[PDB]
């Protein structure tokens, strides 16, 4: 009988020692088993395995609350749909265009690179661990963890089609936001008006117009009575708002806005690239980079900075 000594982990934080037989495969001893990425589930093992780290499934309470504490996810799937992106996410490539960690295309991950480059330009801390760590290292250009972990806080896999929108709403549940407040009024003439406050991830999302002035003076809305309303921002403090709409031909202006997502394409097939306003506007699609004065297509998202804003409106 032929053993080697290993580590196990759910976190690569916190190691447990363990034994394993030669002649029986890593998955008749610990269930699924990842190594440095890669699926040895079905893998005897090896004299060169002594002495490593392999992550396995949270089986037992110790990994369960292992894998709560660093990933803030109870979901028993999270570490296998983690384990099985990275995978992927490890041969994607990752290059600095104009400033910012970008990603080549490959996998259809264009909403992934439009997003990445999206968090390197507003101010958002992520309260899990793992994610907050893997942001980091992403921002320095090693992304590949930061974008599995996407991936797994989705329930989304490599090479399915995603929206930018619905990606930032579910990291942006896992980010500090909770102190974000946004007080907004609507106005008929018959029925009067209504306030409304919104607090966290609510208070910085918008769905409906791109623009933030137009925001600000107000958007015809439909009231019950069969009149038009006025829908208007009193008061916002955030370090950002993303205003969001279905997509529909935009232009946007040099210094007017921090960054935006535009998307070409269908519910089957589409492309997003990033648009960012520096010195002038560069249309970064995942490597290639351009740049140009001006800029209209169809928009998606735009995002500016904010700290706090109040209406003037009386
Ligand atoms: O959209 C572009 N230019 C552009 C400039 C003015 C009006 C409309 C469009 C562009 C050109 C080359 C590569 C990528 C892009 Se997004
Ligand atoms: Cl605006
Ligand atoms: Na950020
Ligand atoms: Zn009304």
């Given at each position: 009988v032929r053993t080697i000594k290993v580590f196990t982990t759910v976190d690569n934080i916190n190691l447990h020692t363990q034994v394993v037989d030669m002649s029986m495969t890593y998955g008749q001893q610990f269930g699924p088993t990842?190594?440095?990425?890669?699926?040895?589930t079905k893998i005897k093992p090896h004299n060169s395995h002594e002495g490593k780290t392999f992550y396995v499934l949270p089986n037992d309470d110790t990994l369960r609350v292992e894998a709560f504490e660093y990933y803030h996810t109870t979901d028993p799937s999270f570490l296998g749909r983690y384990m099985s992106a990275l995978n992927h996410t490890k041969k994607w490539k990752y290059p600095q265009v104009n400033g910012l960690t970008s990603i080549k295309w490959a996998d259809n991950n264009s909403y992934l690179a439009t997003a990445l480059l999206t968090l390197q330009q507003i101010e958002l801390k992520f309260n899990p661990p793992a994610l907050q760590d893997?942001?980091?290292?992403?921002?320095?250009?090693?992304?590949?963890?930061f974008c599995a972990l996407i991936l797994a806080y989705c329930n989304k896999t490599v090479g399915e089609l995603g929206d930018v929108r619905e990606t930032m709403s579910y990291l942006f549940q896992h980010a500090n936001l909770d102190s974000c407040k946004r007080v907004l009024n609507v106005v008929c003439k018959t029925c009067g008006q209504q306030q409304t406050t919104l607090k966290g991830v609510e208070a910085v999302m918008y769905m409906g117009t791109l623009s933030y002035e137009q925001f600000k003076k107000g958007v015809q809305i439909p009231c019950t009575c069969?009149?038009?309303a006025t829908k208007y921002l009193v008061q916002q403090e955030s370090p950002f708002?993303?205003?969001?709409?279905?997509?529909?031909?935009?232009?946007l202006k040099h210094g007017t806005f921090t960054c935006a997502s535009e998307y070409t394409g269908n519910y089957q097939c589409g492309h997003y690239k990033h648009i960012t306003s520096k010195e002038t506007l560069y249309c970064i699609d995942g490597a290639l980079l351009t740049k140009s004065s001006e800029y209209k297509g169809p928009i998606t998202d735009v995002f500016y900075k904010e700290n706090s804003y109040t209406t003037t409106i009386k």
């Open positions: 990842y190594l440095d990425g890669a699926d040895v893997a942001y980091y290292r992403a921002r320095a250009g090693e992304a590949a963890n069969g009149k038009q708002v993303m205003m969001s709409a279905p997509p529909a031909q935009y232009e």
